Design a protein around this ligand. Structure first.
Ligand code: HEM
Ligand code: PXX
Length: 106
């Protein structure tokens, strides 16, 4: 998909996880998020469209999602051990990485 749809997915599923009743729900959402994270990792954001893929800015962008995925995976790992609560805790922490990048590039 494209970037906006990716960020929708990311946002919706983050709400789901806040809302989640069991571990399968959370595993599911996190899995959806992972997919979008990775898709988005190769999109070129509007604000950066005039910069070469080489640039500090574009690399930083892509690094964002590298961090984002890693954190998702830590949460995935937690939801896999059935630890719904600690896993929602980890999703909350995502919000940091969202904002940090939104600050720079949204
Ligand atoms: C899981 C955490 C994240 C959530 C919940 C999230 C959600 C959102 C939302 C709701 C929007 C509104 C824009 C729209 O829908 O049209 C948006 C836009 C945007 N986000 Fe994220 N995002 C997250 C992480 C990130 C990260 C890590 C980056 C950079 C690495 C990023 C970069 C952007 C950019 C560039 C836009 C603007 C898109 C446009 O101009 O069309 N986001 N995001
Ligand atoms: C941040 C950065 O250095 N990106 C890249 C830098 C690259 C520099 C030379 C050749 N390929 C790349 C490249 N290819 C795929 C994805 C990213 C890159």
């Amino acid at each position: 998909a494209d970037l906006e749809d990716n960020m929708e997915t990311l946002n919706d599923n983050l709400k789901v996880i806040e809302k989640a009743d069991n571990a399968a729900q959370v595993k599911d959402a996190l899995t959806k998020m992972r997919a979008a994270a990775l898709d988005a990792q190769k999109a070129t954001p509007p604000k950066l469209e005039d910069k070469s893929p080489d640039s500090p800015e574009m690399c930083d962008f892509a690094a964002g999602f590298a961090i984002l995925v890693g954190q998702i995976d830590d949460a995935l790992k937690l939801a896999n051990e059935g630890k719904v609560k600690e896993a929602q805790a980890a999703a909350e922490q995502l919000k940091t990485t969202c904002n940090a990048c939104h600050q720079k590039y949204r």
